Design a protein around this nucleic acid. Structure first.
Ligand code: TXJ
Ligand code: CA
Ligand code: CA
Ligand code: CA
Lengths: 1005, 218, 419
DNA sequence: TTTTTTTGATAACTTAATCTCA
DNA sequence: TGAGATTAAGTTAT
């Protein structure tokens, strides 16, 4: 088809196995191309002639070197050189699988081999020539030499795409829709064809409606069709029977759409539609290969992913659709759950988290409330997204607590103008979100009417359009294209594999470019190794500006600096006593000078050893550093793309992509220390961690107690390289561009892996920011070296450090001033945790703010603060226990279900199993659910708590707190009191209050 | 050896006392599906549904599991056919007659062997086509396999891809062997050395060895 | 599924059958195989073990201290020696009773055990007894052969065995003290054997019998006796000159024997043995002070700190005496067997074995020191922590560090030329 | 009428249940 | 009937 652009790649699963490509031309027609797919093996030239059945095809790979990357322990300096052998290699293609004994490079996929050897990118535009193409069908072509056909690549051009965003609503009586006894009531489609037309249509099962209701609807303008051929997609509401509804659904699902998008539809929607189709009629949803040679029926299959820590077990489950027509069936639930961390993963929660804006009060009313939004009220792009979602939206949440029905809406040229139904809130600026509703589907189905049918149709089409809104908001198309380009994978499996698989494409490309093969023979023994270093905090409250300096990509840059690769490791030298250790050190300092070799002092891997030195060669760049350089370049490009964005959605997408690439770069290191990986390297991981610890220690030592005065800055220690002598000035007296009247002193107070918190004896925000910028400029050229670079993160105020990894503060960004509004940030405290409470966090915030203000103004003439704080705690707790005005939602906990446990009697197993055995709603193997402590109401306040887990019950979606059941407030109150006690200074009153209220000993940090 | 009745053709739930915590849920699991199950003609005998649920299950140590009864004809118990013609049973019998050392036989009838029980995952089929009743029996098969696994020590299943998702199907860990079906191309079941595996597993789990040639019928 | 899995798990079952007769390597292999089995099959009937106490009482009946009636079968007689007991399960080291200590076999005993066990597979294990730096053929439990032919083959391979006598008894004769004395006299075997354990044909389990009389005696003195090159054995004397044998130094340490104090000692017809089961830091220095400062506890025995030079190096390398380094290199390169052994061993280990120092004590002493090393040779050493000097053995070893460093420098210099 | 491709690391804190010791 | 230590699980920072 000459100028075509690829959309998806898929394989044939018949007796004659083929590979297929779906592409689109500039005009808009679809072209399918077929290839014979083989099994690829790599052999040596000597082995190639020793094959009794001659290979079907063989291509010379040239001369490549094979290197053994097994690691051995040496007790002396007599280290034998690594075994490497250079030989000519052959890539052989077999129509059927073979069993060659001495075959290498066997960890790569066959589709990866096809892509890399044929020089074809999964996504791209090509000029296919007709010499290598023959017609086998109307639109389907056959190619025998994909290498020569794809020799011409052209710049990317835009193409039309087809979308089917679908949702269904099934009647349910008491518990859950059952495909054997409960029918489908509503089916809403957002249909986008290659012409760009966007048609929204909802089909309503008429067998649930009375004849008079059908007449009323058809008079109002609802089409009442009788057969498949009488259906038009240009109408909004179509009344039909269930059989005709299912036939229309099957007809739509059999079309060659580019994308068929659902939210949890692979597990519920598509399965329900299919099973009903075979139950009522007996027909099948037939998928066909492009050449019309092999046909399959729709059958959703389950894919289980196991863990990799402490007895693997099942960890997650996904559901997929089998089809051989090139259509991608996408479920947004799995994509959002894999890529985001949230308290809940329901549609309402994600919509509320994503679709929010700030509204300005413009009118009031007896029961109404008019809002407005634009670029002046909130950030740029929020109002446009809110208006786009508001086209089908019905309910709006105000202040994250009030759910209000939309009375009237008006889309403007810059924002929105919506009037709600809520009391007169006496403020000027509020927050509007698209979240939970106040509709009881169980009650509506029991009193089903025409108006309720129309309301359900509106809600269903809103959900179908929410699928599209989340598709556009998360940049799934852009992410898919980027993943296919980077990982060298078909578009249908970009978000299906973890780091162990998505790096094999670039790894194979790098290995072929460098002409290297890595082999291992010996077994891999596992030993623990030490991680990063965390400094103990010196104070809880500081009342001074703290300057934060953070290393950029610490571990990838450490690996690049040290050339840490399994094939570049010279050896490991261990010692048992001090005599041998000293002799080995004397020999080693002169045998391997450090312009070329680097020696890392690691902790011994065995108790009998007292020393362990890992030697690395930096003459030749390693395999891991090149991959890390590639990924850092990708992340830098995506950061540059992020910084040149003005819309909120584009900024969010770019931030997510750069975070994903940073996590990929980190996972490269993590896999370098993963036993079940091909790139396993215990010594490399130990060396990287040790070098990181040395770097953070060096930064902390040089920054602690480094005063400045006049035009000079004096560092604590000499600017000397912590690994070997280098050609840099070590004088800690540095000329600074700051004016002559500045005099301040610094003191290191905390550290974590690569972050250093340095306080300054100052309070002026502009002064602190200027000094921090100057210092960050100064400690990147005179202090650091090679590729080690740090950046000034922010200025922290009112820093309250509870522990070594939990602290809350107010953040001033690098580009800010005194008048700039701070941002409140919490790291590890009981406010970002997903399983503490909602009632807990608000009180924690209020009490922490009050304590910060009260310490800032000046107090502590006596016990003082403790008395009033504990009195307030007692009053609030007794008021909550008596009134019980808080809802059940404020006392809800979240936990993830999984089957990775040491014992089968674990209470977490029992709770989920018992819930599943008595509830039609089944919690999957990676589903996050809700639970809470509920106790009999007649039970009074309990002093000594004995059993806690026995009171846990799962609040799925509709649990009702009965008269006999009440929230067991004791656990929450005890946790809140225990957290608050550790914040205060005086103790005797704290233990006294804990004994009086509960009757235990409060643990102190 | 008791029984319970339901409102659907089979309504012949003769069951043993050791199968007690099964029927009380199987009744609801089968009532909602019997109406659509009995509308078609199957190829077990309809009365041969709850026939292996009256046997004592705390006597067997190894369980061999089938995925589907024979697409043509059928008796009611897996891997039994006193009309010996089929290829799968031929391949099963050849590799065990070679192991035991008996050359003269008139079938195997693996059911009669003490210490082992043949199991069918899907309790019904249809004439001509296989795996045509999976939806009607999925949850019932799950519950029955879970109960059988809870009592036996080792489970044997036929079909690699057909039983590729059995670990998540059961919540209680158990010794499981998934063997190749004796109908694939190249006759891979000949290379399948699994009977020795299950036997030596019984000795490794301090269980009484089970004689294997006992079931031969002359 | 496959043959490899079958072989692996049947080897796991075989290892499970012999669980008490295991060492560190076998425990690690068993754990690895259990992990592989439970990962592949999702469940395994056996679990992990980490303690593994060595027990032999499951193959031996309760001890007998009373005349008893016997008549079953033949009466192959086998005495029991006095001393430490070691177990050779299959291709392993020597396992001590209780704690799974790994004894250091010199060379010939391990080869003899391997050659004896390679003949068949029906033998449960091989039992050895060590007394004053010598081995003896103990009971040979076996489920296939009678122990007579195992004894004969072990004797002809090169190790020593006790004599055996077979007698047929018709009626239930009352074995008494007189029969025990007569058969121990007929055994000759001047080595101080304590008990006698006769086998029973047909009955797999063996039986042990010994007769003794309690006695109380007085302690005169404790003295060391030479039984080798710097290997000393403790001993005591009585007023009448009677000798009370002690199996090893640990027996004396646990007994807490006090000078000029009455003790309980088990007396027999020929010789008598002190009885155990009567802190450690007090005795470990008190006995050292009484016997002499110039002594230390070399593991199971006593060793004397003295001179260390060319004579010790020649003795340890099994070469004749010489004068200079050139004669050393010539005499150790003349035969290619010794030089290969020297190449495979480090300077530190070779010097430590030449001076006969302990392993753990010397390692701790070295790790609690500071050294100045030039040209791969030691010229200055000093103590950084004096706490480790509290142990008298550490002080005794440190008192002669000059000889050790001289030997270390000589070995380093000669290895610089042997390559 | 049945069958190829998976799996990043450690450090630090909090709470409940179990084991051990006055 | 308390105190103290230890292990397993969940979750976050880096
Ligand atoms: N997913 C992660 C996250 C963190 N770390 C530890 C360490 C090295 O990756 O974090 C140091 P940085 O250089 O990645 O720094 P940080 O995580 O703060 O990223 P940055 O601010 O540079 O985007 C890790 O190993 N894996
Ligand atoms: Ca839905
Ligand atoms: Ca919906
Ligand atoms: Ca960083």
């Amino acid at each position: 088809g000459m100028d075509v652009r690829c959309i998806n790649w898929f394989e044939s699963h018949g007796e004659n196995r083929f590979l297929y490509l779906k592409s689109r031309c500039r005009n808009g027609e679809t072209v399918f191309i077929r290839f014979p797919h083989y099994f690829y093996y790599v052999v040596t030239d000597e082995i190639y002639q020793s094959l009794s059945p001659p290979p079907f095809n063989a291509r010379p790979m040239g001369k490549m070197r094979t290197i053994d990357i097994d690691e051995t322990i040496s007790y002396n300096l007599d280290i034998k050189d690594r075994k490497c052998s250079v030989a000519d290699m052959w890539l052989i293609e077999e129509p059927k699988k073979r069993s060659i004994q001495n075959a290498t490079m066997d960890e790569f996929f066959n589709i990866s081999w096809f892509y890399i050897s044929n020089g074809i990118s999964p996504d791209g535009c090509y000029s296919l020539d007709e010499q290598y193409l023959t017609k086998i069908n109307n639109g389907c072509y056959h190619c025998d030499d994909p290498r020569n056909c794809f020799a011409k690549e052209i710049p990317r051009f835009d193409i039309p795409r087809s979308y089917l965003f679908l949702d269904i609503e099934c009647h349910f009586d008491k518990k859950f829709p059952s495909v054997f006894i409960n029918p489908i009531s509503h089916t809403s489609y957002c249909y986008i064809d290659l012409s760009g037309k966007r048609l929204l249509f909802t089909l309503i099962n008429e067998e649930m409606l009375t004849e008079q209701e059908i007449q009323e609807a058809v008079d109002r303008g609802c089409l009442r069709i009788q057969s498949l051929m009488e259906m038009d997609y240009e109408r909004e509401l179509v009344l039909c029977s269930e059989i005709v509804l299912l036939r229309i659904a099957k007809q739509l699902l059999e079309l060659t759409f580019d994308y068929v998008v659902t939210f949890n539809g692979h597990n519920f929607d598509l399965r329900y539609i299919t099973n009903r189709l075979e139950l009522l009629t007996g027909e099948k949803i037939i998928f066909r290969s492009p050449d019309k040679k092999e046909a399959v029926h729709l059958c959703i299959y389950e894919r289980n992913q196991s863990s990799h820590k402490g007895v693997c077990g099942m960890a997650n489950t996904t559901f997929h659709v089998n089809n051989n027509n090139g259509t991608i069936f996408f479920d947004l639930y799995s994509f959002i759950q894999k890529s985001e961390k949230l308290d809940s993963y329901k549609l309402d929660s994600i919509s509320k988290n994503a679709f929010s804006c700030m509204g300005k009060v413009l009118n009031r009313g007896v029961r109404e409330m008019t809002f407005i939004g634009d670029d002046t009220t909130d950030a740029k792009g929020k109002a446009d997204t809110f208006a786009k979602v508001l086209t089908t939206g019905n309910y709006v949440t105000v202040d994250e607590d009030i759910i209000c029905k939309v009375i009237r809406k008006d889309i403007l040229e810059n924002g929105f103008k919506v009037v709600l139904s809520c009391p007169t809130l006496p403020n000027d600026i509020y927050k509007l979100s698209f979240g939970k509703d106040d509709i009881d589907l169980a009650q509506m189905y029991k009193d089903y009417n025409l108006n309720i049918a129309l309301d359900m149709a509106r809600y269903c089409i809103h959900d179908a359009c929410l699928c599209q809104y989340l598709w556009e908001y998360y940049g799934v198309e852009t992410k898919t294209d980027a993943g296919a380009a980077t990982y060298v994978l078909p578009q249908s499996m970009v978000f299906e594999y973890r780091a162990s698989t998505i790096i094999k494409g670039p790894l194979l490309k790098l290995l072929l470019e460098t002409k290297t093969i890595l082999v291992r023979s010996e077994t891999k023994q596992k030993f623990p190794y030490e991680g990063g270093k965390v400094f103990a905090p010196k104070q809880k409250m500081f009342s001074n500006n703290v300057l934060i300096f953070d290393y950029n990509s610490l571990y990838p840059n450490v690996c690049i600096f040290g050339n840490l690769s399994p094939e570049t490791l010279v050896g490991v030298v261990v010692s048992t006593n001090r005599l041998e250790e000293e002799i080995n050190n004397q020999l080693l300092l002169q045998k391997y000078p450090p312009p070329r070799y680097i020696t890392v002092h690691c902790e011994p891997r065995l108790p009998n050893l007292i020393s362990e030195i890992a030697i690395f060669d930096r003459s030749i760049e390693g395999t891991i550093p090149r991959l890390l350089r590639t990924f850092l370049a990708e992340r830098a490009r995506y950061k540059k793309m992020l910084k040149q964005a003005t819309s909120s959605t584009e900024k969010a997408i770019y931030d997510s992509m750069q975070y994903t690439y940073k996590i990929v770069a980190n996972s490269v290191y993590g896999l370098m220390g993963f036993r079940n990986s091909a790139l396993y390297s215990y010594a490399s991981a130990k060396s990287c961690t040790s070098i990181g610890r040395r770097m953070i220690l060096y930064l902390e030592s040089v920054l602690n107690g480094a005063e400045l005065s006049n035009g000079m800055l004096r560092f604590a220690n000499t600017l000397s390289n912590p690994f070997y002598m280098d050609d840099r000035d070590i004088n800690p007296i540095v000329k600074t561009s700051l004016p002559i009247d500045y005099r301040f002193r610094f003191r290191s107070v905390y550290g974590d892996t690569d972050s250093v918190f340095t306080e300054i004896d100052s309070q002026d925000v502009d002064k602190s920011i200027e000094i921090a910028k100057e210092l960050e400029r100064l400690i990147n050229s005179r202090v650091l070296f090679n590729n080690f670079k740090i950046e000034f993160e922010a200025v922290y105020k009112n820093l309250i450090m509870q522990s070594k990894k939990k602290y809350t503060t107010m953040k001033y960004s690098a580009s800010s001033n005194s008048k700039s509004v701070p941002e409140r940030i919490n790291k590890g405290t009981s406010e970002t945790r997903r399983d503490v409470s909602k009632f807990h966090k608000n009180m924690i915030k209020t009490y922490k703010t009050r304590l910060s203000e009260m310490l800032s103004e000046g107090r502590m003439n006596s016990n003082q603060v403790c008395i009033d704080i504990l009195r307030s705690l007692e009053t609030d707790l007794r008021s909550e226990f008596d009134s019980r005005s808080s809802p059940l939602e404020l006392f809800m906990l979240s936990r993830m279900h999984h089957s990775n446990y040491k014992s089968a009697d674990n209470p977490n197993m029992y709770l989920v199993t018992e819930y599943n055995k008595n509830n039609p709603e089944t919690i999957e193997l990676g589903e996050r659910y809700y639970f809470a402590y509920i106790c009999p109401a007649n039970v009074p306040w309990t002093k000594k708590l004995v059993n806690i887990k026995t009171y846990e019950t799962i609040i799925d979606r509709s649990f009702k707190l009965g008269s006999n059941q009440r929230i067991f407030y004791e656990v929450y109150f005890k946790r809140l009191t225990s957290e608050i006690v550790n914040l205060l200074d005086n103790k005797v009153l704290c233990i006294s209050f804990f004994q009086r209220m509960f009757g235990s000993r409060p643990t102190f940090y | 050896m008791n029984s319970v009745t339901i409102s659907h053709a089979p309504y012949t739930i003769t069951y043993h006392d050791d199968w007690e915590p099964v029927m009380s849920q199987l009744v609801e699991f089968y009532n909602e599906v019997a109406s659509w199950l009995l509308r078609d003609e199957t190829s077990p005998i309809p009365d041969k549904f709850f026939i292996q649920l009256k046997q004592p299950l705390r006597n067997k140590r190894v369980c061999v599991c089938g995925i589907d009864p024979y697409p043509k004809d059928g008796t009611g118990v897996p891997f039994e056919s006193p009309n010996f013609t089929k290829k799968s049973i031929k391949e099963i019998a050849s590799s065990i007659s070679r192991l035991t050392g008996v050359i003269d036989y008139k079938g195997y009838n693996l059911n009669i062997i003490d210490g082992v029980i043949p199991w069918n995952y899907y309790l019904s089929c249809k004439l001509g086509e296989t795996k045509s009743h999976a939806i009607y029996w999925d949850k019932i098969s799950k519950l029955l396999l879970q109960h059988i696994t809870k009592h036996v020590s080792v489970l044997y299943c036929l079909g690699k891809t057909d039983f590729s998702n059995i670990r998540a199907k059961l919540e209680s860990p158990v010794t499981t062997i998934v063997g190749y079906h004796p109908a694939a191309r190249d006759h891979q079941f000949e290379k399948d050395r699994s009977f020795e595996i299950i036997n030596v597993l019984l000795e490794l789990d301090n269980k009484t060895p089970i004689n294997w040639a006992q079931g031969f019928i002359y | 599924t496959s043959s490899a899995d079958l072989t692996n798990l049947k080897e796991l079952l075989s290892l499970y059958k012999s669980l008490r007769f295991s060492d560190s390597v076998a425990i690690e292999k068993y754990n690895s195989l259990v992990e592989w089995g439970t990962s592949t099959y999702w469940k395994i009937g056996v679990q992990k073990v980490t303690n593994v106490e060595t027990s032999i009482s499951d193959y031996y009946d309760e001890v007998k201290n009373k005349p008893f009636n016997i008549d079953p079968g033949y009466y192959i007689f086998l005495p029991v020696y006095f001393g430490s007991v070691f177990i050779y399960s299959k291709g392993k080291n020597m396992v001590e009773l209780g704690s799974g200590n790994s004894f250091q076999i010199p060379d010939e005993i391990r080869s003899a055990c391997n050659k004896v066990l390679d003949s068949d597979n029906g033998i449960d294990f091989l039992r050895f007894v060590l007394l004053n730096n010598r081995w003896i053929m103990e009971d040979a439990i076996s489920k296939y052969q009678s122990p007579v032919n195992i004894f004969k083959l072990a004797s002809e391979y090169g190790l020593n065995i006790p004599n055996y006598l077979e007698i047929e008894i018709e009626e239930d004769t009352l074995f008494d003290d007189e029969l025990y004395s007569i058969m121990e006299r007929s055994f000759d075997d001047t080595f101080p054997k304590i008990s006698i354990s006769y086998i029973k044909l047909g009955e797999l389990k063996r039986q042990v019998v010994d007769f003794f009389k309690f006695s109380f005696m007085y302690i005169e003195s404790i003295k060391v006796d030479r039984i080798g090159d710097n290997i000393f054995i403790p001993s005591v004397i009585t007023k009448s000159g009677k000798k009370i044998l002690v199996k090893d130094v640990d027996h004396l340490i646990r007994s807490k024997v006090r000078e000029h104090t009455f003790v309980k000692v088990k007396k027999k017809n020929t010789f008598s043995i002190l009885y155990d089961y009567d802190t450690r830091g007090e005795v470990i220095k008190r006995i050292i002070d009484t016997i002499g400062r110039d002594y230390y506890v070399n593991g199971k025995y006593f060793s004397k700190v003295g001179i260390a030079g060319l004579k010790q190096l020649t003795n340890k390398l099994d070469i004749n005496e010489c004068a200079t380094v050139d004669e050393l290199v010539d005499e150790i390169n003349k035969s290619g067997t010794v030089k290969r052994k020297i190449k495979n061993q480090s300077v530190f280990d070779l010097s430590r074995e030449c001076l006969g120092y302990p392993e753990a004590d010397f390692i701790t002493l070295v790790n609690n020191m500071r050294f100045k090393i030039e040209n791969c040779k030691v010229v200055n050493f000093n103590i950084e922590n004096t706490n480790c000097l509290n142990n008298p053995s550490i002080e005794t070893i440190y008192g002669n560090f000059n000889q050790f460093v001289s030997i270390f420098n000589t070995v380093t210099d000669v290895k610089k030329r042997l390559f």
